[PDB]
Design a protein around this ligand. Structure first.
Ligand SMILES: Nc1nc2c(ncn2[C@@H]2O[C@H](COP(=O)(O)OP(=O)(O)OP(=O)(O)O)[C@@H](O)[C@H]2O)c(=O)[nH]1
Ligand SMILES: COc1cc2c(c(OC)c1OC)-c1ccc(OC)c(=O)cc1[C@@H](NC(C)=O)CC2
Ligand SMILES: Nc1nc2c(ncn2[C@@H]2O[C@H](COP(=O)(O)OP(=O)(O)O)[C@@H](O)[C@H]2O)c(=O)[nH]1
Ligand SMILES: [Mg+2]
Lengths: 417, 422, 155
């Protein structure tokens, strides 16, 4: 039932706080933690994210100024004081500072807050972590956190919302190093990872929404809407009785292939057929990969609002039959639909898409080409080795991420025969 | 006076069990608080000093959401708390988890609760076990329970009501794996199993009841009508199938191929009319559109056939309709008969449900080779995924070995050949 | 040696240490183990002042290290715009090719330094230059699905 939420670094705390803000309005919780809804459905699965109402959230950072950013926000006063774990100085975009030095000293004090929130759960389902892979704390300390949580709670589900770097949003040349060193950690220690790519979020804001200079607020509006969409079935009763573990078992055919490509419709800053085709469109994906360049292993589509269940059924069959070639034929009925009656804020009809496609390799090949470009000239490698880190961890990491790409292409060209 | 114990396992089993026990109450005139203002119905209901009629049933699930509905529904007062058993975490659609890890933490508690119901029985005949083939609990925990019940109650019979998976009715990708694994491991612990195909029940609700998109209540209300006709012989005075043992005798000539097909007619919308003759409702049983399992019996042979009539049915009218039917082929060395049974009690429907109350109905129970079509479909889905070893790590990660997937599939290959030899 | 100290000075950005070391006769074209000169280091770490002093005192603008990397390759890779502009004005070879077949334009393109891509193009960077794997910055723009870059390369 219960999920413990961990938010790490500046990106992690920003997207983290916008998540709590979005879902609190859906569940009718005001900033003081008091319920004010008009439906019993809002309070039925409140135990999942809230403690009796207070978010079951842990707030970590090495930079103490993000505490003040968090408290400043609309729902900043809702989080528990004891749950804030902060350092004296940030990681300066150094994954090694986050993973091996400053972060590793503070990491034990975080596990004591986790252990406190976890020991208070009726039956803990798992962990939800928000972070970026480009920085130092969220990527370096966060992956360390993941590692220590997995050794303490090996039977629990570990899920991440991981934001991938793009030069379009942060032109910091060390971020591909930080993302590659983290993707290596995520392949071994997460059950499910939602790959939110800042390149995709920038291309949607810039080209589709036409925002000339998008801010983190414009990017985070899509991350928050995606986060609400994918967690819908965990938070509301409907025709589906499921948790993070059932999602994992049916979404992950092979252990390492647990990187999901989420999408949302409609895109903001409508009929059922128009919503269905948009969900399988590259312009609605939160990862910059063309889904028509690969094949889907598994797909989950959560629809939200009042609509004809029959129209949702036939339109979803109409896609598969028309586009037989994009779905692997060796996983029978690999497209699952869930229709939830409660729509999101300011809309009467929404669709959320969760794909496990072989086209995700495009996102990884982008990060690898950048890593490689920098790693060949040995650029800034001293910043990392100076924090007590081996040079061969850079080669472990690249090698592992390159293996992942090979697996995806293996299963993309595999026939049923 | 021979008692029957019903075990309802997982979501599907509990939800169909709720539909059943509500319908038995309407048939026997028992109130939602267990009081009855008026032997036969005592096979299914024990009595308390206070005059309460308590179902002889156990509801089990590894997570409580479903059973909590029962603890606050119309029949909250019908079951004592101890008959409703729940864990805090489910098998997550994984047979291994329901059988080897999570299921082992609660099997003992469940056996104590069954032993409490059994010590209240003067002549326990056996158990009726309801479950999905697809769920982690429905598949894994049930197979664990069937193994243990063979040891602790070795001379008693076990009948099953199993829900076969259908893509139209919210199935999980791994349901073909769970289905094959539970079948393999239960094949020697069950005496007779009535499969219910969710695709069949779903097409009947659409075709015959005009429902645009059925939900589990619609499907379950129809299912419970079929289950009640099968169990009517055990809860009323009767000539045919009066004890669990007679089901094997009448329907199962060969022990491994113990999956009879059930057909029910007439299925009429409460909206829709005149009344159907005994001849017409009998003919409907041979129409493939009325079967609990999607298969063509005209592309197969019969090993056994039972017709169970309910309501205003004169025996001479049946003999005429059966005579017409002979003028459909049988297995080589088996007899070419029909066993008929008549209960003159009118068929009951849930007040304000989707089914129309009719004057006469029939349930035909047949054991036909055409049911192998259902196994062929499941095995094919298993083969496509297993060739690539898709999803297998979830199973081996929960105490299972890969060799078990192979034994199970071999057992199904051998069951497909058993149907082809017969 | 005075060259070893000069290299550390250029890397560390010490403007005054650089000037003092050269006054005492330090090898302005000294190299470290990898074949890097004070100009490469200065160019890698964004020390434009040192880049200027070195170019005025006999620094080989088109020097190469063990892998064929010139200062311009590195300034483009890390994305120091003013440093790219100074090197070009002082005779940096816009189309220099390293051991991987990479030009400074390939690197600007890969790292997404779009302002540098414009500056290199305006200074005669060859858009038709292919690397060891046969890819041009235009090809890289297709593979990575980067329409912002594709548009800059179509002129
Ligand atoms: N007819 C019918 N089918 C159902 C019902 N509930 C679930 N199913 C089917 O049963 C399968 C899913 O198994 P469940 O019973 O929900 O699972 P479970 O036994 O609780 O096991 P877990 O995996 O532990 O949740 C699918 O084929 C569903 O279509 C129901 O009430 N009626
Ligand atoms: C808690 O949230 C979810 C949990 C699950 C699923 C899902 O997608 C609708 C969810 O919403 C995102 C799910 C996913 C995909 C499946 O196959 C592709 C499947 O077999 C089955 C499912 C779900 N089962 C059904 C019948 O929809 C169970 C796991
Ligand atoms: N979309 C999004 N990206 C962000 C946000 N904050 C930081 N980033 C990205 O995260 C990376 C920097 O990570 P950061 O969290 O600031 O470092 P940390 O605080 O040490 O973990 C860069 O790729 C930034 O674009 C945010 O609020 N939203
Ligand atoms: Mg269940």
């Amino acid at each position: 039932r219960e999920i413990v939420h961990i938010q790490a670094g500046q990106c992690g705390n920003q997207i983290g706080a916008k998540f709590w803000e979005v879902i609190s309005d859906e569940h009718g919780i005001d900033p003081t933690g008091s319920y004010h809804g008009d439906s019993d459905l809002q309070l039925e699965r409140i135990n999942v994210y809230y403690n009796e109402y207070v978010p079951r959230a842990i707030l970590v950072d090495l930079e103490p100024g993000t505490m003040d950013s968090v408290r400043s926000g609309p729902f900043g006063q809702i989080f528990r004081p004891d749950n804030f774990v902060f350092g004296q100085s940030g990681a300066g975009n150094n994954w090694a500072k986050g993973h091996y030095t400053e972060g590793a000293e503070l990491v034990d004090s975080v596990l004591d807050v986790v252990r406190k929130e976890s020991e208070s759960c009726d039956c803990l389902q798992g962990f939800q972590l928000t972070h970026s892979l480009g920085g130092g704390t969220g990527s370096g300390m966060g992956t360390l956190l993941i590692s220590k949580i997995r050794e303490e709670y090996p039977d629990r589900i570990m899920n991440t919302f991981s934001v991938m770097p793009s030069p379009k949003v942060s032109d910091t040349v060390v971020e591909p190093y930080n993302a590659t060193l983290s993707v290596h950690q995520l392949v071994e220690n997460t059950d499910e990872t939602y790959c939110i790519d800042n390149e995709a979020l920038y291309d949607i804001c810039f080209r589709t929404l036409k925002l000339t200079t998008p801010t983190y607020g414009d990017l985070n509006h899509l991350v928050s809407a995606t986060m609400s969409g994918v967690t819908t079935c965990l938070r509301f009763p409907g025709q589906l009785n499921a948790d993070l573990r059932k999602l994992a078992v049916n979404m992950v055919p092979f252990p390492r292939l647990h990187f999901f490509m989420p999408g949302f419709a409609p895109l903001t800053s409508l009929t059922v057929p128009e919503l269905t085709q948009q969900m399988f469109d590259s312009k609605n994906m939160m990862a910059a990969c063309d889904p028509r360049h690969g094949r889907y292993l598994t797909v989950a589509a959560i629809f939200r609002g009042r609509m004809s269940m029959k129209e949702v059924d036939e339109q979803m069959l109409n896609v598969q039959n028309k586009n037989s070639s994009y779905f692997v034929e060796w996983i029978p009925n690999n497209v699952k639909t869930a229709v939830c009656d409660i729509p999101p804020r300011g809309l009467k009809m929404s669709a959320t898409f969760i794909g496990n496609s072989t086209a995700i390799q495009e996102l990884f090949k982008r990060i690898s080409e950048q890593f490689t470009a920098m790693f060949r000239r040995k650029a800034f490698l001293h910043w990392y080795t100076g924090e007590g880190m081996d040079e061969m961890e850079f080669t472990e990491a690249e090698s592992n991420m390159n293996d992942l790409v090979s697996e995806y292409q293996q299963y993309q060209d595999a026939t049923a025969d | 006076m021979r008692e029957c114990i019903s075990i309802h396992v997982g979501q599907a089993g509990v939800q169909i069990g709720n539909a059943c026990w509500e319908l038995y109450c309407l048939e026997h005139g028992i109130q939602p608080d267990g009081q009855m203002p008026s032997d036969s119905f005592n096979t299914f209901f024990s009595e308390t000093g206070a005059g309460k009629h308590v179902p002889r049933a156990v509801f089990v699930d590894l997570e409580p959401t479903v059973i909590d509905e029962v603890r606050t529904g119309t029949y909250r007062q019908l079951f004592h708390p101890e008959q409703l058993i729940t864990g805090k975490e489910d098998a997550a659609n994984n047979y291994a988890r329901g059988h080897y890890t999570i299921g082992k933490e609660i099997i003992d508690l469940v056996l104590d609760r069954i032993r409490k119901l059994a010590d209240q029985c003067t002549g326990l005949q056996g158990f009726l076990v309801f479950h999905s083939f697809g769920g982690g609990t429905g598949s894994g925990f049930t197979s664990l329970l069937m193994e243990r019940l063979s040891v602790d109650y070795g001379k008693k019979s076990k009948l099953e009501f199993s829900i076969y998976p259908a893509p139209q009715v919210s199935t999980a990708v791994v349901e073909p794996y769970n289905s094959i694994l539970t079948t393999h491991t239960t094949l020697e612990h069950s005496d007779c199993a009535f499969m219910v195909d969710n695709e069949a029940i779903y097409d009947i609700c659409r075709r015959n009841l005009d429902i645009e998109r059925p939900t589990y209540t619609n499907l379950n209300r129809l299912i419970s009508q079929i289950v009640s006709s099968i169990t009517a012989s055990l809860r009323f005075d009767g000539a045919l199938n009066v004890d669990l043992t007679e089901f094997q005798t009448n329907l199962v000539p060969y022990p491994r191929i113990h999956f009879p097909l059930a057909t029910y007619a007439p299925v009429i919308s409460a909206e829709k009319h005149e009344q159907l003759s005994v001849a017409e409702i009998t003919n409907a049983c041979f129409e493939p559109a009325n079967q609990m399992v999607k298969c063509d019996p005209r592309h197969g042979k019969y090993m056994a056939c039972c017709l169970l009539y309910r309501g205003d049915v004169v025996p001479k009218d049946v003999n005429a309709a059966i005579a017409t039917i002979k003028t459909i082929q049988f297995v080589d060395w088996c007899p070419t008969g029909f066993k008929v049974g008549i209960n003159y009690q009118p068929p009951t429907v849930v007040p304000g449900g989707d089914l129309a109350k009719v004057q006469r109905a029939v349930c035909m129970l047949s054991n036909t080779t055409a049911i192998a079509e259902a196994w062929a479909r499941l095995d094919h889905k298993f083969d496509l995924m297993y060739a690539k070893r898709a999803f297998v790590h979830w199973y081996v990660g929960e105490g299972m070995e890969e060799g078990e997937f192979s034994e199970a599939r071999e057992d199904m290959a051998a069951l497909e050949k058993d149907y082809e030899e017969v | 040696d005075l060259g070893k100290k000069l290299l550390e000075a250029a890397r560390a950005g010490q403007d005054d240490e650089v000037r003092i070391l050269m006054a005492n006769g330090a090898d302005v074209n000294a190299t470290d183990a990898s074949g890097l000169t004070p100009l490469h280091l200065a160019a890698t770490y964004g020390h434009l002042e040192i880049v200027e002093v070195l170019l005025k005192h006999g620094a080989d603008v088109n020097a190469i290290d063990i892998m064929g990397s010139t200062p311009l390759h590195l300034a483009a890779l890390i994305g120091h715009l003013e440093i790219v502009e100074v090197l070009l004005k002082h005779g940096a070879d816009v189309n220099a090719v390293d051991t991987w077949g990479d030009t400074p334009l390939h690197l600007a393109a890969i790292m997404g330094h779009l302002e540098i891509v414009e500056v290199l193009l305006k200074h005669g960077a060859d858009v038709n230059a292919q690397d060891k794997f046969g890819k041009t910055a235009f090809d890289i723009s297709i593979d990575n699905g980067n329409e912002d870059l594709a548009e800059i390369l179509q002129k």
